[PDB]
Amino acid sequence: AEQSEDQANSQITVKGHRTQKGVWGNDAIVQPVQTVADSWVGANIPLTIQHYGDATNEGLQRRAKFEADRRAAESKSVSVTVFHVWDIGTVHYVEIPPEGIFDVLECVSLTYTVDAKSTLETKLELAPPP
Amino acid sequence: GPCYNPDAEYLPASFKGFSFDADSSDSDHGRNGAEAEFVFGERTGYADLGIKIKSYQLRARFQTNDHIAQTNAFIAVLESPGPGLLVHPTRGTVFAACRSARVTDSKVDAAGVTYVELDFVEANSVLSGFG
């Protein structure tokens, strides 16, 4: 398990421009902005990921939350190798007390390996319990 | 046999023209191939991939009031460039190339005799521009 801190971000500000029909000037150059926050990281690690289509309030916040789930899901990566060989999006309860995991996690990856000698093992990469 | 004449049945050893008397004669013939072990199966595979390169192993003795000079001449011949024609005592004439020659020689333990452990390899030319 590795929950680093170089790939997190407190405030994600999404800006852009409005691409609707008729909308021009301020309502298409000035207004569109949004500031979503992840009240788990810590100090002010700001950011600004700009938008590239029809910047609506919902569009802004949604791109924002998408990346705020990417960075989140990269800030606790749990690679486990299990024994014998259905989890591409499955959630499981995982218990690793020594590193303080008592939580429900989503498997992002799944790798079955084999080799007639010493193998048959499955490697899972999991998803953080924010 | 009862009347097996040894020195009329083994060929006198000699490498690259320089003759010597051998005390042993080995060889490492063979044939190399793959071995398939398909998973979860009561079956096996084999695929013959060619001929295994031969190697010969001999042990020379020098027991004469001039074994030092003979040993030094033999050393000078063995380190001459390129492969040469070898007369293996029990396999006849081959083209071999020296690979190692250990020369053991004690003084206050066994003075007078010198033993040499030789290791040759089957050596054929190719041509120059890959065939």
Using an 8 Å CB-CB cutoff, list chain A residues near B39. 114-116
A81: nearest Cα among A121, A127, A126? A121
Q: Tokens in use for B56?
A: 């010969």
Using an 8 Å CB-CB cutoff, list chain B residues near A115. 39
Interface check A114 vs B, CB under 8 A: yes
Backbone phi and psi for residue A70, each to the nearest 5 degrees, phi listed first: -60, -60
Interface check B37 vs A, CB under 8 A: yes
Q: Tokens in use for B57?
A: 């192993």
Question: Experimental method for this entry?
Answer: cryo-EM
Write the single-letter amino acid at B21.
Answer: D
Rounded Cα gap, residues A1 and A77, in angstroms: 6
Cβ atoms of A71 and A11 within 8 Å: the answer is no
Rounded Cα gap, residues A84 and A112, in angstroms: 9
Interface check B39 vs A, CB under 8 A: yes
Q: What is the resolution of this structure in A?
A: 3.2
Cα B42 from chain centroid (whole Å): 41
CB neighbour class for A46 (10 Å; exposed up to 12, middle 13-18, buried from 19): exposed
Residues 6+ apart with CB under 8 A from A26: none
Please tell me which residue of chain B has the smallest CA distance to A117.
B39
Half-sphere CA count of B3, side-chain side, radius 13 A: 0
Interface check A84 vs B, CB under 8 A: no
Backbone phi and psi for residue B102, each to the nearest 5 degrees, phi listed first: -85, 135
Rounded Cα gap, residues B12 and B20, in angstroms: 7
Please tell me which residue of chain A has the smallest CA distance to B41.
A116
Interface check A116 vs B, CB under 8 A: yes
Rounded Cα gap, residues A63 and A115, in angstroms: 43
Closest-CA distance, B47 to chain A, in angstroms, reads 19
Cβ atoms of A64 and A89 within 8 Å: the answer is no
Tracing tokens 């191939």 back to the chain, one arrives at B33
Rounded Cα gap, residues A117 and A96, in angstroms: 29
Cβ atoms within 10 Å, residue A32: 21
DSSP string, A73-119: HHSSB-EEEES----SS-EEEEEEGGGTEEEEEE--EEEEE--TTS-
Please tell me which residue of chain A has the smallest CA distance to B36.
A116
Cβ atoms of A128 and A76 within 8 Å: the answer is yes
Cβ atoms of A124 and A107 within 8 Å: the answer is yes
H or E stretch at A60: helix A57-74
